[PDB]
Amino acid sequence: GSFVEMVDNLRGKSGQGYYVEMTVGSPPQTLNILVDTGSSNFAVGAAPHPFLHRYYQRQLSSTYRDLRKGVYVPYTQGKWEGELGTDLVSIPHGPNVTVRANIAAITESDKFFINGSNWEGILGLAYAEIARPDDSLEPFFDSLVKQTHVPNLFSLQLCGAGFPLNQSEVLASVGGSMIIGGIDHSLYTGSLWYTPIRREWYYEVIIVRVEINGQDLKMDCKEYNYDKSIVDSGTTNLRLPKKVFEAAVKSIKAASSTEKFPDGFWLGEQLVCWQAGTTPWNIFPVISLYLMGEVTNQSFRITILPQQYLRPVEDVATSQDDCYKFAISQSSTGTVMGAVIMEGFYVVFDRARKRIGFAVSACHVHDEFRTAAVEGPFVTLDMEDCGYN
Numbered sequence: 001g002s003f004v005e006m007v008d009n010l011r012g013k014s015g016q017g018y019y020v021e022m023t024v025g026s027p028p029q030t031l032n033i034l035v036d037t038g039s040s041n042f043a044v045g046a047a048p049h050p051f052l053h054r055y056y057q058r059q060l061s062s063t064y065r066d067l068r069k070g071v072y073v074p075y076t077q078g079k080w081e082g083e084l085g086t087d088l089v090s091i092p093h094g095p096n097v098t099v100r101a102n103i104a105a106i107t108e109s110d111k112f113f114i115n116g117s118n119w120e121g122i123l124g125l126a127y128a129e130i131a132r133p134d135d136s137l138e139p140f141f142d143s144l145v146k147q148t149h150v151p152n153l154f155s156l157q158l159c160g161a162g163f164p165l166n167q168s169e170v171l172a173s174v175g176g177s178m179i180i181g182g183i184d185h186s187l188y189t190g191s192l193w194y195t196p197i198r199r200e201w202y203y204e205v206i207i208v209r210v211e212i213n214g215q216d217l218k219m220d221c222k223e224y225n226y227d228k229s230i231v232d233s234g235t236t237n238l239r240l241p242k243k244v245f246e247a248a249v250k251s252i253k254a255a256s257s258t259e260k261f262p263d264g265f266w267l268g269e270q271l272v273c274w275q276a277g278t279t280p281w282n283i284f285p286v287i288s289l290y291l292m293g294e295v296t297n298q299s300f301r302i303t304i305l306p307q308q309y310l311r312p313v314e315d316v317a318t319s320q321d322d323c324y325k326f327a328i329s330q331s332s333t334g335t336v337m338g339a340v341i342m343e344g345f346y347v348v349f350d351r352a353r354k355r356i357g358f359a360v361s362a363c364h365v366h367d368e369f370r371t372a373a374v375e376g377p378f379v380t381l382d383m384e385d386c387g388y389n
């Protein structure tokens with residue numbers, strides 16, 4: 001069951017995001033749009049900006065409808081404001097449909113559009129509960145499903161290159177696949193394992209155990225999900241609650257201790273470099289996250305490698321060295337399984353059956369000695385108790 005129209009429709013990288021081509025308005029205006037499972041607004045640049053090569057021009061669209069309502073969206077870093085409306089929307093390398101969707105026309109922003117990232121808007125794929133200004137603003141995917149025969153499911157294969165890409169190479173390179181309305185079975189190996197969507201707001205899941213090279217981190221499982229755990233393509237890092245983060249870094253440091261790295265490396269700010277080809281992957285441990293399964297008392301685990309959690313970055317001296325930043329960082333808003341984790345796996349957002357599937361990605365970076373894994377089942381008890389209230 002192939003989806004050749006959708007395979008390879010993404011570009012980008014974990015640092016700047018993965019984006020899909022979309023069109024808005026009549027005649028169609030083409031824009032690059034960030035695929036974001038961590039938010040629920042479809043918002044596009046709609047006025048000139050130094051980091052935008054193009055933007056939505058509502059006065060040039062005959063199908064534009066003005067909702068006469070403003071919207072303000074602050075994040076931790078950065079923010080934007082805009083004006084709500086509706087227009088006709090298509091995904092050229094997607095299903096063959098056009099739908100009328102809500103669009104936030106971004107008229108002012110701060111630290112949102114970053115220099116050189118290539119996207120001109122964001123596609124929030126999560127649920128109405130977290131849509132701004134409120135849950136009456138129907139999200140794009142909800143409109144798509146309501147107005148067409150597209151099944152209520154999409155899947156993502158984000159492909160990390162394993163090495164840096166300049167803006168030129170990012171433009172020329174295939175960065176992965178967003179399969180709308182289905183599962184392309186060629187994008188993964190082994191089996192798909194499903195975890196329940198705890199609640200439809202973010203794509204919230206429940207982590208029940210964490211291992212570093214097989215060694216149980218041994219925290220009360222509520223700590224892993226405090227105050228939620230989500231799957232989020234619009235966040236770069238694996239983000240861990242403060243207490244889990246501190247304990248994981250201590251374990252990763254202990255496992256990797258034949259080499260010492262400065263504190264700024266572990267804080268995710270400073271790069272570390274090795275001579276070309278000599279990255280010592282084997283000194284870094286694998287990390288396993290166990291997730292609640294669909295069957296009572298059952299869990300499965302996903303396992304990533306340093307090739308996922310060390311993010312390739314360009315050198316300050318631009319040498320031939322292979323350089324990386326540590327892509328695990330602390331959070332005060334729960335666990336975020338961001339792009340560097342998703343690059344390990346084909347991830348199926350099965351909205352129709354309220355679950356999220358994971359399988360080893362056919363494009364994951366690994367070495368001759370170890371690969372990412374998705375394995376199960378494990379007998380686990382009182383998993384309900386891992387969720388925060």
Ligand SMILES: NC1=N[C@@H]2CCCC[C@@H]2CS1
Pocket residue numbers: 036037038039075122232233234235
């Ligand atoms: N998943 C997230 N989405 C929003 C919008 C896209 C840029 C990054 C922010 C913060 S985290």
